[PDB]
Write a protein that binds this ligand. Structure first.
Ligand SMILES: CCCCCCCC/C=C\CCCCCCCC(=O)OC[C@H](COP(=O)(O)OCC[N+](C)(C)C)OC(=O)CCCCCCC/C=C\CCCCCCCC
Ligand SMILES: CCCCCCCC/C=C\CCCCCCCC(=O)OC[C@H](COP(=O)(O)OCC[N+](C)(C)C)OC(=O)CCCCCCC/C=C\CCCCCCCC
Ligand SMILES: CCCCCCCC/C=C\CCCCCCCC(=O)OC[C@H](COP(=O)(O)OCC[N+](C)(C)C)OC(=O)CCCCCCC/C=C\CCCCCCCC
Ligand SMILES: CCCCCCCCCCCCCCCCCC(=O)OC[C@H](COP(=O)(O)OC[C@H](N)C(=O)O)OC(=O)CCCCCCCCCCCCCCCCC
Ligand SMILES: *[C@@H]1O[C@H](CO)[C@@H](O[C@@H]2O[C@H](CO)[C@@H](O[C@@H]3O[C@H](CO)[C@@H](O)[C@H](O)[C@@H]3O)[C@H](O)[C@H]2NC(C)=O)[C@H](O)[C@H]1NC(C)=O
Ligand SMILES: *[C@@H]1O[C@H](CO)[C@@H](O[C@@H]2O[C@H](CO)[C@@H](O[C@@H]3O[C@H](CO)[C@@H](O)[C@H](O)[C@@H]3O)[C@H](O)[C@H]2NC(C)=O)[C@H](O)[C@H]1NC(C)=O
Ligand SMILES: *[C@@H]1O[C@H](CO)[C@@H](O[C@@H]2O[C@H](CO)[C@@H](O[C@@H]3O[C@H](CO)[C@@H](O)[C@H](O)[C@@H]3O)[C@H](O)[C@H]2NC(C)=O)[C@H](O)[C@H]1NC(C)=O
Ligand SMILES: CCCCCCCCCCCCCCCCCCOC[C@@H](O)COP(=O)(O)OCC[N+](C)(C)C
Ligand SMILES: CCCCCCCCCCCCCCCCCCOC[C@@H](O)COP(=O)(O)OCC[N+](C)(C)C
Ligand SMILES: CCCCCCCCCCCCCCCCCCOC[C@@H](O)COP(=O)(O)OCC[N+](C)(C)C
Ligand SMILES: CCCCCCCCCCCCCCCCCCOC[C@@H](O)COP(=O)(O)OCC[N+](C)(C)C
Ligand SMILES: CCCCCCCCCCCCCCCCCCOC[C@@H](O)COP(=O)(O)OCC[N+](C)(C)C
Ligand SMILES: CCCCCCCCCCCCCCCCCCOC[C@@H](O)COP(=O)(O)OCC[N+](C)(C)C
Ligand SMILES: CC(C)CCC[C@@H](C)[C@H]1CC[C@H]2[C@@H]3CC=C4C[C@@H](O)CC[C@]4(C)[C@H]3CC[C@]12C
Ligand SMILES: CC(C)CCC[C@@H](C)[C@H]1CC[C@H]2[C@@H]3CC=C4C[C@@H](O)CC[C@]4(C)[C@H]3CC[C@]12C
Ligand SMILES: CC(C)CCC[C@@H](C)[C@H]1CC[C@H]2[C@@H]3CC=C4C[C@@H](O)CC[C@]4(C)[C@H]3CC[C@]12C
Length: 998
């Protein structure tokens, strides 16, 4: 027992340092947030007229508004006041450290951090984007990387630790190579015929599909009969793949003999599994099948323990909270429906709740589970499931990732021009004329219409810039030469950009600025910032590194697309066009008509006596295979996963009003898709990526990636600083006056005392709350002097002792800086207390931030936190280059969105402050969706194409389609951005992982 106890202490010691780092960073950021905005979110609107709150369209909750300029304003007739109630159920805010640590925890884990990021900005202001980017990068991305690296190192160390029929049979053995190609082509054609379905399905089309299925079944059955006849059970049946083929074909002909053909729709797509037969031709698909098999096979024990854990947690939650869930339904249920959409009453819903927790969404059900049970018991269960659940899942993801993978005078002029081009006077000029040109696009926003001078200046700048670029291009042509220029890869990335701009501007100036293709091309002017990729050394290097994996990414992309086509043909069959519903739309907010009044289309048509009954489809549905792909991508990115998963369960059949959870068991389809097209299809992409960088690195022979030569030598210098830190030993003072001061300073317990004092300062900083007694305010202020005075005295003592000898140490300079900063902050506060200098309290609470600079002293005294911070220090250049590339991508998409969706109707995620009409708002939205959070909410107001959800007919300034977007371009934009950002962030994670690996 003692041996296993010690073993458990071990394998936790591995995460000891990372856990302490997480706790300390969370505490520091909690203190920063608490000081910045405490009890600020409780700023609901109240009508000047008891309490009168207005509600934002589409949401019953009150509207958090705040005083300031950046912060979100409030409708006329309302004054933002510190109404005493927190926005979400009264359970989310920064009014105290205990409520600030949890908010930062859920901001690190990223669960629904979109709401927090758009609330705290609405209240405090837009300028607070800095805190959120900092906590996401330094907090979320960094801490998850380090935890993943800890688990990876632990498990890597574990891994490396240890008659007539006979005549026909003779003639039936043709088995020509043409036969296998023919059968494979037959499989592909069967799939492509079964993958062309839709809502229309004219009778001729239905008959054609039926006869096609019949003939293909006939061919497959004839082939199986011929093979079994030619072979015997010992030869034919003995094969695993033959058994699979026989099972699928017999399940296809039995249903082909059923009364209701594939009425189940699970059997109408059971034959579709045969596409696995393409495993022979496809190595990547073979590897995917191997991944799944070994996950269920050799590595099946880990999955079994995961499943039993999830089942046990779901059962415990049900048994403990179902009675309260039923007794208090009205407390958490939606305004109209009588039951919560997600609850824990019966085992199925408890298991779905636990799966939602494991999926990365827990607070939404946490809050509600607090207003139906004791806060203590419901808080433990929700947190323990997350930590244990996400640890066990990431334990499988690595186990699968380590077993399947790795287990005349003209020529003189030409030469002169060639030499001139290489000159710095032109190179640097072009580099910063490519930066200014890219930057100038940010001012082309929707509000630009209101500043005629600004747009005129911008168009002058654009014309001059394109003229300059044409001159540069023709000079480069006349110097370098046609073949030399066109050989390079980037040379033509500039040529096509220049031509796009040229033809667009020529069309505009030719009084032909009305052609739809011309307008679309002009909308592609967001490609101008792309021109800065070649010039910058680091961005060019990272671009080359990324392009080095296109061959290794295309195969996995194709395999994922096929394995998703299967699930997009299973979903289209199970439920197509069955998502339509009859809604009642009185104001923005609408209530689907109860099935008592209208239960089908004609009823919703004859009872239109209210003037508002509407029959409209869900925004994301399963009508055809393209929408199936979109609705599977939303479930894979885990955003919009409920609007298309609620429609599924409430639908009954074609042209019938959805009923409350009639298809309560249709959640299994989405659960299965999540499992397979997620944990078993991203694991493939990741393994392929960790072998395409491991290769090409062993090929590079250790050459650093994402880094230039100057950055490499700087990295080497810093690596030496990792051992050069110590300076010469300090001589002891000779005179008693300085000698006694020195020998008192340098002592066994001096450092312990200073650390304890910093800990006490942290304690007295965290005891702070919102709206506390004036007595406690005075106490904190006075103890905020007992500490600043003491630290300044100690710093001046150590400065007097040893004179300039100690100044050589860098961190001594750092702590001197923090102490003098505290003194300066106190002086500034005292001076600003005057009657002449008065500003918002935010200025007080931001100047008071110097204390955290004064409590960062523990870093120099830390054990492993300092090592991890050193690793981050070394990795900074690589992450800087990748961040430059990511910001360039974000800028491209910002310009695209600003040009394309500045008129959509403000619904769901979009608001009056998170629109696309301004560059700041566009950057805010793109930063939010960079992690694929709320992208569904931003997409939904674009999918709308007709009334009432959007009014296609609406002046909308000059906006076309009124308040309705273009679903095709919206889907392309958002899907491309999320995929590209996933690639860039996984590059960042790989860079950090390898930097810590060294
Ligand atoms: C959706 C698809 C979901 C799961 C994949 C199922 C794979 C079916 C393979 C059919 C062909 C066959 O029978 O080939 C067995 C291979 C032969 O390969 P070999 O041993 O000769 O080498 O054997 C193996 O690799 C091991 C068996 C096949 C790969 C592991 C599959 C484990 C999944 C189990 C149940 C899935 C239920 C799906 C529910 C809807 C979703
Ligand atoms: C996995 C892939 C399967 C995807 C499709 C799963 C089933 C989709 C929905 C469906 O058509 O399911 C068939 C039935 C009904 O389901 P329902 O949602 O209409 O419930 C109706 C409840 N009522 C009758 C009280 C109103 O299922 C039932 O009778 C309940 C028992 C079976 C539930 C589906 C089991 C699928 C098994 C998956 C393991 C692999
Ligand atoms: C990047 C951001 C975050 C990660 C930091 C990673 C570690 C940074 C190490 C900084 C460092 O080593 O530089 C200390 C500096 C410069 O000294 P030196 O390195 O040239 O070595 C001098 C001694 N010789 C000559 C023997 C080499 O010391 C001085 O002079 C005084 C100035 C001290 C500045 C460094 C502070 C680094 C730690 C915290 C920054 C704030 C983080 C905030 C996070 C968000 C919370 C809201
Ligand atoms: C590992 C590597 C990454 C792998 C990722 C795989 C993800 C696969 C799914 C991607 C989304 C596909 C998707 O949304 O469907 C294709 C989309 C949507 O369909 P639609 O017919 O336009 O919809 C109805 C139509 N709008 C209408 O007018 O009613 O409409 C289109 O036809 C647009 C296709 C382009 C955008 C989506 C697919 C390609 C994305 C590539 C991004 C790569 C970035 C690097
Ligand atoms: C939409 O749903 C409604 C209600 O289900 C359908 O109307 C219904 O039509 C049926 C068949 O005519 C009616 O059944 C009949 O009821 C009368 C007595 O009212 C009885 O004498 C007949 O023998 C038969 O049982 C049903 O009552 C009627 N319900 C109502 C209130 O309208 C409607 O046809 C559906 N429309 C579509 C196209 O989905
Ligand atoms: C129930 O009755 C209402 C009212 O007739 C129907 O709404 C109507 O829907 C049509 C088609 O969407 C609308 O046509 C267009 O509407 C826009 C926006 O008003 C307008 O700009 C166009 O000129 C054109 O009229 C129609 O206006 C709209 N009428 C109203 C006032 O709602 C609804 O479709 C009916 N629903 C059912 C299921 O019977
Ligand atoms: C479906 O939508 C319609 C239209 O919004 C709803 O009817 C509307 O109900 C409101 C009351 O919530 C009516 O406003 C007021 O009603 C009171 C009734 O005493 C009246 O005294 C006021 O002068 C005022 O009219 C509104 O007029 C009425 N509009 C109509 C005629 O459709 C309907 O209740 C909704 N039904 C469901 C089940 O969602
Ligand atoms: C580092 C950690 C994160 C710190 C927070 C993120 C970075 O700090 C944001 C604040 O500095 C914004 O400036 P103020 O505090 O002056 O707020 C604006 C107030 N007026 C000027 C409009 C009245
Ligand atoms: C991927 C697999 C190959 C491509 C499969 C492509 O799917 C083709 C279907 O979408 C065609 O039908 P629609 O969705 O255009 O529906 C027709 C709507 N009307 C004509 C009835 C109005
Ligand atoms: C690659 C895939 C090739 C797929 C070839 O697609 C052929 C058909 O799906 C075309 O169908 P339509 O888009 O014309 O829809 C007609 C539907 N109604 C009007 C008859 C109902
Ligand atoms: C997949 C491979 C390619 C397959 C191509 C299939 C082409 C054949 C299917 O194309 C569909 C169109 O012909 C229209 O749909 P129908 O054939 O049902 O005719 C209905 C006509 N109305 C009612 C719309 C006027
Ligand atoms: C949204 C994009 C995010 C970034 C990732 C995706 C990038 C896609 C590709 C964009 C750039 C495509 C052109 C640049 C990539 C290829 C080039 C990538 O770097 C070029 C070096 O590999 C080779 O140098 P050069 O091509 O200048 O010339 C050397 C001699 N050879 C190579 C010509 C024989
Ligand atoms: C089996 C255990 C349960 C697994 C739950 C599901 C575990 O996560 C599923 C992943 O597919 C989620 O992917 P990400 O969150 O990384 O988003 C990336 C989306 N794209 C960019 C790849 C499309
Ligand atoms: C309802 C449909 C669409 C989804 C479920 C598909 C199921 C039934 C599939 C996926 C995994 C498949 C099995 C995979 C492996 C083997 C072993 C082989 O020696 C015979 C076939 C057999 C036993 C398959 C039978 C069919 C199977 C169980
Ligand atoms: C049409 C206008 C706007 C832009 C024209 C850009 C032209 C010159 C660019 C666009 C894409 C380029 C091609 C992209 C990739 C390759 C493969 C390489 O192995 C040989 C050159 C070749 C074939 C390039 C030749 C130049 C090219 C065709
Ligand atoms: C190691 C310790 C500090 C970890 C945290 C301990 C717990 C008990 C801390 C976390 C936040 C703390 C609270 C933060 C702020 C206030 C307001 C103050 O006017 C009274 C104390 C009170 C209400 C604190 C009580 C103790 C508290 C709940």
């Amino acid at each position: 027992l003692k041996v296993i106890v010690g073993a458990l202490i071990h394998s936790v010691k591995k995460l000891a340092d990372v856990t302490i780092l997480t706790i300390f960073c969370l505490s520091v950021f909690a203190l920063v947030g608490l000081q910045l905005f405490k009890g600020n979110l409780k700023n609901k609107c109240v009508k000047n007229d008891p309490d009168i709150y207005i509600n934002k369209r589409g949401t019953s909750d009150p509207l958090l508004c705040g005083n300031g300029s950046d912060s979100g304003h409030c409708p006329d007739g309302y004054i933002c006041l510190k109404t005493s109630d927190n926005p979400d159920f009264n359970y989310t805010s920064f009014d105290s450290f205990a409520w600030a640590f949890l908010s930062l925890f859920r901001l690190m884990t990223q669960d629904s951090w979109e709401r927090l990021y758009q609330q705290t900005l609405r209240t405090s202001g837009k300028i607070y984007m800095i805190f959120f980017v900092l906590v996401i990068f330094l907090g979320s991305f960094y801490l998850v990387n380090l935890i993943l690296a800890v688990v990876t190192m632990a498990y890597e160390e574990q891994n490396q630790a240890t008659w007539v029929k006979l005549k026909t049979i003779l003639f039936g053995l043709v088995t020509d190579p043409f036969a296998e190609l023919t059968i494979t082509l037959c499989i592909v054609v069967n799939t492509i015929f079964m993958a062309m379905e839709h809502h229309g399905m004219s009778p001729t089309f239905e008959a054609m599909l039926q006869i096609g299925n019949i003939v293909f079944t006939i061919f497959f059955t004839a082939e199986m009969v011929f093979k079994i006849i030619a072979f015997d059970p010992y030869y034919y049946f003995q094969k695993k793949w033959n058994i699979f083929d026989c099972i699928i074909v017999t399940v296809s002909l039995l249903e082909l003999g059923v009364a209701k053909k594939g009425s189940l729709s699970v059997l109408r797509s059971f034959r579709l599994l045969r596409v696995f037969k393409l495993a022979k031709s496809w190595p990547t698909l073979n590897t995917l099948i191997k991944i799944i098999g070994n996950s269920v096979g050799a590595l099946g024990n880990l999955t079994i323990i995961l499943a039993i854990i999830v089942f046990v947690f779901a059962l415990v939650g049900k048994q403990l909270l179902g009675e309260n869930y039923r007794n208090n339904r009205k407390n958490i249920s939606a305004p109209h429906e009588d039951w919560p959409r997600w609850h824990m009453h019966d085992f199925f819903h408890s298991f779905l709740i636990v799966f939602r927790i494991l999926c990365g969404e827990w607070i939404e059900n946490m809050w509600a589970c607090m207003e139906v049970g004791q806060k203590s018991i419901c808080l433990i269960l929700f947190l323990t499931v997350m930590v244990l659940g996400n640890l066990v899942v990431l334990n499988l993801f690595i186990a699968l990732l380590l077993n399947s993978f790795s287990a005349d005078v003209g020529w003189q002029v030409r030469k002169t021009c060639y030499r001139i081009v290489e000159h710095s006077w032109f190179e640097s000029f072009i580099i910063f004329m490519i930066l200014l040109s890219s930057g100038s696009l940010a001012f082309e926003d929707y509000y630009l219409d209101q500043k005629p001078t600004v747009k005129a200046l911008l168009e002058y700048t654009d014309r001059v810039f394109t003229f300059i670029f044409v001159f540069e291009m023709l000079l480069k042509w006349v110097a370098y030469g046609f073949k030399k220029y066109f050989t390079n890869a980037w040379c033509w990335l500039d040529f096509l950009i220049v031509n796009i701009s040229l033809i667009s501007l020529t069309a505009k100036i030719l009084e032909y600025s009305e052609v739809a293709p011309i307008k679309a091309l002009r909308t592609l002017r967001a490609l101008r910032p792309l021109r800065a990729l070649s010039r910058f050394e680091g961005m060019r290097v990272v671009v080359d590194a990324l392009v080095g994996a296109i061959p290794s990414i295309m195969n996995v992309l194709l395999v994922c697309l096929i394995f998703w086509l299967i699930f997009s043909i299973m979903g289209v069959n199970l439920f197509a066009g069955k998502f339509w519903r009859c809604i009642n739309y009185t104001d923005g907010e609408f209530s689907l008509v109860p099935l008592s009044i209208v239960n089908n289309k004609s009823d919703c048509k004859i009872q239109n006596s209210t003037g508002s009954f509407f029959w409209v489809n869900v925004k994301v549905n399963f009508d055809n295979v393209a929408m199936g792909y979109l609705a599977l991508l939303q479930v894979a990115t885990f955003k919009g996963w409920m609007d298309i998963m609620y429609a599924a369960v409430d639908s009954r059949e074609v042209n019938m009003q959805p009923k409350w959870e009639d298809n309560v068991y249709m959640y299994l389809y989405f659960v299965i898709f999540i499992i397979f097209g997620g944990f078993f299809t991203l694991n493939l992409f990741v393994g392929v990526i960790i072998d395409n960088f491991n290769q090409q690195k062993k090929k590079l022979g250790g050459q650093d990636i994402f880094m230039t030569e100057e950055q490499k030598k700087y990295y080497n210098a810093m690596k030496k600083l990792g051992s050069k830190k110590p300076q010469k030993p300090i001589p002891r003072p000779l005179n008693k006056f300085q000698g006694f001061v020195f020998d008192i300073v340098t002592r066994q317990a001096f450092d312990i005392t200073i650390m304890v004092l910093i800990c006490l300062n942290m304690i007295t900083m965290m005891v702070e709350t919102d709206d506390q007694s004036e007595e406690k305010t005075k106490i904190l202020g006075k103890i905020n002097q007992f500490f600043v005075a003491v630290f300044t005295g100690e710093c001046v003592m150590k400065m007097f002792a040893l004179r300039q000898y100690y100044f050589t140490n860098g961190w001594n300079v750092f702590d001197f800086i923090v102490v003098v900063l505290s003194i300066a902050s106190l002086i500034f506060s005292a001076i600003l207390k005057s009657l002449q200098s008065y500003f918002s309290p935010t200025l007080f609470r931001v100047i008071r931030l110097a204390r955290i600079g004064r409590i960062l002293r523990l870093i120099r005294a830390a054990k492993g936190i300092r090592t991890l911070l050193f690793a981050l220090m070394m990795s900074l250049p690589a992450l800087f280059n990748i961040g430059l590339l990511l910001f360039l991508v974000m800028f491209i998409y910002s310009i695209f969105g600003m040009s394309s969706f500045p008129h959509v109707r403000w619904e769901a995620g979009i608001d009056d402050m998170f629109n696309f009409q301004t560059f700041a708002n566009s950057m805010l939205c793109l930063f939010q969706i960079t992690t694929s959070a709320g992208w569904d909410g931003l997409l939904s107001p674009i999918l709308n194409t007709g009334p009432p959800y959007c009014d296609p007919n609406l002046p909308n300034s000059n906006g076309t389609r009124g308040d309705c977007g273009s679903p095709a371009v919206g889907i392309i934009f958002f899907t491309t951005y999320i995929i590209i950002s996933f690639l860039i962030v996984v590059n960042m994670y790989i860079a950090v992982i390898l930097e810590n690996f060294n």
